[PDB]
């Protein structure tokens, strides 16, 4: 079933899903398509909330039907970063997240390009390949942003 989704601003592009594909599957397609995590996609079936532990048959996802997604104010995970000025900013992340992705989000909040950023968690400098999960970066961990090139 090719199927579509209304958003807070409202957005719709290429799509396909099957009655067997999980309610988590459609939202995962939403993450892969829109860059918006699964714990921030609030999903509705015609004024009813799509839940967990139920195929989209359990509602059910007929082809060419409009489900709805609106953006949760935050996700399940967030970390703090100490800023060039020593202030705290807090970032919505997932253990999946690459350091390249975190530096994008910091570039989002503070406007410094990731190529000029250096991130320090526990004395350790973080490289653009690895993830928050690897480095055992947990909820409420603080990272220190520094200027690569030392400043």
């Amino acid at each position: 079933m090719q199927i579509f989704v209304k958003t807070l601003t409202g957005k719709t592009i290429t799509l396909e899903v099957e009655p067997s594909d999980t309610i988590e599957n459609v939202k995962a397609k939403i993450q892969d398509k829109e860059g918006i995590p699964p714990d921030q996609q609030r999903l509705i079936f015609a004024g009813k909330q799509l839940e967990d532990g139920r195929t989209l048959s359990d509602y059910n996802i007929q082809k060419e039907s409009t489900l709805h997604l609106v953006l949760r104010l935050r996700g399940g995970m967030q970390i703090f970063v100490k800023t060039l000025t020593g202030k705290t900013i807090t970032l919505e992340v997932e253990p999946s997240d690459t350091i390249e992705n975190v530096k994008a989000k910091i570039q989002d909040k503070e406007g410094i390009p990731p190529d000029q950023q250096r991130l320090i968690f526990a004395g350790k400098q973080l490289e653009d390949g690895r993830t928050l999960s690897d480095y055992n970066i947990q909820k409420e961990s603080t990272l220190h942003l520094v200027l690569r090139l030392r400043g």
Binding site: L73, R74, F80, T90, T142
Partner: protein, 72 residues
């Protein structure tokens, strides 16, 4: 056969008026509903701000904690 069609139309019309009324009631509900979410939104930003503030204070306190502790 016009009489039958007029009785049917008037019936359907009673039904329409019923539905439109219930509808308008639901719309009032929607205005207070919007106000409410705007509040929850506000509350959330207020709280994130507080959390961020406490996080800076905490980190300060903890620094002094580390330095003083290994110092004495």
């Amino acid at each position: 056969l016009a009489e039958q069609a007029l009785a049917s139309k008037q019936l359907q019309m009673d039904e329409m008026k019923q539905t439109l009324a219930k509808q308008e009631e639901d719309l009032e509900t929607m205005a207070v509903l919007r106000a409410q979410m705007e509040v929850y939104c506000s509350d959330f930003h207020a709280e994130r701000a507080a959390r961020e503030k406490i996080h800076e204070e905490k980190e300060q306190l903890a620094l002094q904690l580390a330095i003083l502790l290994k110092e004495n």
